[PDB]
Amino acid sequence: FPGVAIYLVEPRMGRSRRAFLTGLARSKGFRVLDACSSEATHVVMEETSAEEAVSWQERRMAAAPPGCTPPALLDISWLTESLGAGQPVPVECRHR
Amino acid sequence: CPGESLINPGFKSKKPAGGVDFD
Amino acid sequence: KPRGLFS
Amino acid sequence: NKAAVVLCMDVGFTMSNSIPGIESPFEQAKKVITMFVQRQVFAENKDEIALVLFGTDGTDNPLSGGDQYQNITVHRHLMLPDFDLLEDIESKIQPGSQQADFLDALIVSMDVIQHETIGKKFEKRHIEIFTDLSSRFSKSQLDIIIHSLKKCDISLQFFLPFSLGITEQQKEGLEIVKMVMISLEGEDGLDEIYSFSESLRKLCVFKKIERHSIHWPCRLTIGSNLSIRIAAYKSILQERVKKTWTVVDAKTLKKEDIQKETVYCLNDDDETEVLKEDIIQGFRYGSDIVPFSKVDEEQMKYKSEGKCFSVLGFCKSSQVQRRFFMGNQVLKVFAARDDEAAAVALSSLIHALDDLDMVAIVRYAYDKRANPQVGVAFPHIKHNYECLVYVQLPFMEDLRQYMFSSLKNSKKYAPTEAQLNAVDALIDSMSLAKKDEKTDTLEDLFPTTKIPNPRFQRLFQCLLHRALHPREPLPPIQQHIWNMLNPPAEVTTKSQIPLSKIKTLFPLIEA
Amino acid sequence: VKNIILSNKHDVVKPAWLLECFKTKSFVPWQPRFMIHMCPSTKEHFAREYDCYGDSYFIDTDLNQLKEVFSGIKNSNEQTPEEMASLIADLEYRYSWDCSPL
Amino acid sequence: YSGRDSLIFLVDASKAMFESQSEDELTPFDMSIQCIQSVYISKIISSDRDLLAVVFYGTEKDKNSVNFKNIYVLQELDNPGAKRILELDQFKGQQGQKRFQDMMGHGSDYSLSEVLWVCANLFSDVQFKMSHKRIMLFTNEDNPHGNDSAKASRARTKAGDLRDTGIFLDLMHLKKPGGFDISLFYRDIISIAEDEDLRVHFEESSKLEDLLRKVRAKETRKRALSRLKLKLNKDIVISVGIYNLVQKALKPPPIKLYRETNEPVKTKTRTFNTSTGGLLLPSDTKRSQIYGSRQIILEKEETEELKRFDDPGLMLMGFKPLVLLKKHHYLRPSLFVYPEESLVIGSSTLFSALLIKCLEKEVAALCRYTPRRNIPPYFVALVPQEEELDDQKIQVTPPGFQLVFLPFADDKRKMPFTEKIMATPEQVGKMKAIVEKLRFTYRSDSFENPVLQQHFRNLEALALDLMEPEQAVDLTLPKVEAMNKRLGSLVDEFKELVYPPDYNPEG
DNA sequence: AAACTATGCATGCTCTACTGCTTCTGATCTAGTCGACT
DNA sequence: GACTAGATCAGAAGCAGTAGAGCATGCATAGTTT
Fold this sequence. Notes:
The structure is cut from a larger assembly and holds chains A, B, C, D, E and F.
Chain A: E1 6-8, H1 15-27, E2 42-44, H2 50-62, E3 72-74, H3 76-85
Parallel strand pairs in A: 1-2, 2-3
Chain C: no helix or strand
Chain F: E1 4-12, H1 28-46, E2 51-57, E3 71-78, H2 82-89, H3 94-103, H4 112-125, E4 130-138, H5 149-165, E5 168-171, H6 186-189, H7 207-212, E6 226-231, E7 237-243, E8 255-258, E9 265-273, E10 286-290, E11 295-298, H8 300-305, E12 313-321, E13 335-339, E14 344-345, H9 347-361, E15 363-370, E16 378-385, E17 388-389, E18 395-397, E19 400-405, H10 425-437, H11 450-464, H12 480-487, H13 490-498
Parallel strand pairs in F: 1-2, 1-4, 4-5, 6-12
Antiparallel strand pairs in F: 2-3, 6-7, 7-13, 10-11, 12-15, 13-19, 15-16, 16-19, 17-18
Helix pairs in contact in F: 4-5, 10-13
Chain F binds a DNA duplex through loops.
PDB class: ligase/transferase/dna
Keywords: nhej, Pol mu, XLF, paxx, LIGASE-TRANSFERASE-DNA complex
Entry title: A gap-filling complex with Pol mu engaged in the NHEJ Pathway
């Protein structure tokens, strides 16, 4: 599934957890970008509130090209469910 | 109240340990 | 001296 | 250690009918076998069990021949006990209509033991006969049977519906059983014949947790020239469960899907992680923290010569009081195995200490890594064996100096004469020891040291109930567990009037 | 520092080294003069171009440097009067060293 | 006794305190500084939550809230630490004396009323509850105010006011060229004037020796582990408290620090699924145990409920003769049971009657003990314990009950069978002679834990940056030389009488 | 007959949790002073 | 009324002690292979 891009925020979940999640996603076929890039389409946070998420989105936009599609804020539940099912899961309001 | 510990009020002073002293 | 079924 | 047990059972119609007011022999035998199997299953002792039945229409055994050796089936061969055996006992074993002679069943059991014993070091063999002796007896092969029993060194036991109002056939059966027991062992053989009621009482409790102490060699030293080789074991200690609960995933019920791991992070908004190689030790010295790396701690750690058993000195037994005993174990010290001079020296020391009424203050260290300890060793002499008993003693730090008010010289809590008389009556009525005047001896009516720990009994009961009933709430505590934890009813009965009197005399108001 | 010395895994340097580094605004190579202890790797490195004492055989020395070298050396009594006198005489004869007034 | 103990170290800064009578002697100022340092270290090791202060009087500079003259409060009431010890260390030597003179000065006048006022102000500032208030006066001037009588009257009035407030005053009089005389002025200021403390003392006070004696053992205030109910039967209940008169001493728990900046870190444990990566709380997971080639699954709640037998407390079962109790059946350190009248009124009377009758009849109360909820019951024996006092009437054995645990059938282990060999009377006599030669008196506080003492010494050396750690003498090591000297030839005779010519015990 | 490996025991150190006792801090309240009004 | 300042109660934090599990280390004991 090269169509979709998944990025995990390092500075809020820890190095070991991020490495384990990336390894599991890679073994499951998902492609995870090690470094932040414009091609990212899904962003997953961990133990975070709405205010911190929106501030992170603003910071990311502050150094992003115009006329693009910023990723969608998602919770770790979405990633865990997608890994468990083995295929991408539809996004709902709770994940957003 | 003789023998009271000056350093720690309310606790009885403890004599230094002498180990074994043969009679 | 318990032995057999009892040991 | 290893053992093989061949349970021989009777399934003839003779046991299918009995007095309605009492349980039938078949049900009692089934209960006894089930209890034994449970005890063996929950006590992993590497013992094997086989099950043979006689009196059923079926016929399946190694030695068929002609009409002889019929109506006998080797239902279960020699193998480790497991829950499927209990399930087979519960349902598969059913009453039968045909009768059989238990001599042929004994022959079949002996053949099974002989065939399945080879290839393994079975140091013990037992055959238990659960028979009512209703069927007729064909004692045409007694001599060869006894010869085989003696040659193979196989123990025999019997279980009958009556303890040592029966038909003459039962009397003849009992006589032949007594003859067999006398031939096998003699007089004491008469004690190897049990009854279902007696066996149920003995097998109503799970086996105790048993562990083997490791022999600890050392040398008791008095100075720098006297040394006695000694071996120490652990006598008294708080027993724990051999096995611990394992965390599993609810859905897949597997320990491989659950991973536990510890991480370290700093107190920052990012909570950045730090590897274990960047983590140092530190201690609290007042209002600030002093770093102390582990390597420096080992460099400065107190070093001692491990495995030491030295006699610091000797002191009167009065000076050492039981209330000061510390630690979590009691050590028993004997002379070195296969050593006569050490035995003589230790016996001399023990006898001298007992005659002088004194104990030895000693320094004990398990090994290099173990912290040194100061303890007391006192003699223990018995009619058959003598040794030393070692118990740890407190350091100056461990002692606590607490002040408590005196009750004897209190003008507000002074008991009256009537109150003292009531307390005396209560103490006399609730005595747990009986003084036999003929022998002038004290008998303990409530021995605590012989009571199995209820914790393990409860754990085994619940585990068994879950295994046999996957979907069912856990049961309540067994009645016999409560009974064995309470004093005999006789003691309780005599304590009613004294207790009522004490209530009347002593006011007690909850605040 | 004693604990670090007893663990041969690090190098101990006197503060004077960093003061000299500040003075010259450049990285000054280490020296046994600015040192209290050496890890095995530094012992192997300095054992090549620096003798066991605090002296080198690649760079010349002055009065102060020789005084520093002699300071580290401790008095030893493996000699006897007559043999020391004879060795002194041989040394004085070897290098045209008989011209001293004392 | 609830609260914290506060202490103030008043040190005179007069000229007479800086003069040494002999060349090889310690000046009074240095002795006072050493005593303060020793008390600081002892407090750090034993009671780190206590408050200490250091104040000087008679100096040229001043530092106080009220802005008095010639009073420099060097350290206010605060928990002890290494920083204060290091700060005090800069006055220990002669160079330290010069530094102290330069920083503050000496040889100025002073008034004791101002000193006591400053001490009271320092005491008032503390917000925590203070069980004890104490001041110590390190001085060698028995007549601080001989020329003026109004100053003496003001000092007397202030001392009386402080005594009424509840502030203890102690005088650690030091050596004087002439001789200290308490009767002159300090009889009134001092809180308690002992009868023996009226003669002229020609030497420093004996309390300085006690102060200099470092105590490196933790001190714990009285506390009750549990306050349970003793139930003679279902309807007779009394309230008792349980205490641990003996408790193992352990090193303080280590703390995890960061290498770069010594900043404490936080450790977190978590459990995650391998095939999914999600985080599982300690309720999703179940428990398992493989018995009989089968898996048995129990929930956490059921596992905890397996241990529920009876409500916490002690339930009476009967009375047993003390002879049946066995010394070698030790299983766990014993506890102390005392009355507790707060919960139930009338418990003390019944407890006293039971204790008296148990002592009279020499019996022990067998009971079933359940310390906390969901804990399997144990069988214990309450042995009466009478009140025993020493020569000076100081209580050494309190009155109450001794709770001793009794082993179950699973707590005993079978022993290998060993044949018995009996020694001849001559060998027993020789061993008796040896034992008599090696006799000594035993006390419960005659030994110290070498590991804890060495750990404390190392910690102090690291904190104070001392040159080398102080080595602690181990009293638990056998005295081989003394034993060899005392025994004499007895060892050789015993070895000849008990061992064959070629035995080689070591081999 | 000798070497390697499975099995077990004893002990010290550490994370983790839970229960109970003591002390500190936030929150809920009456006396003194100034002021408003009538 | 409003403010300010005193005094009273109840919940949370610290600490002590216990229990369970795991790890590491060391040692001993017995079974299997060559």
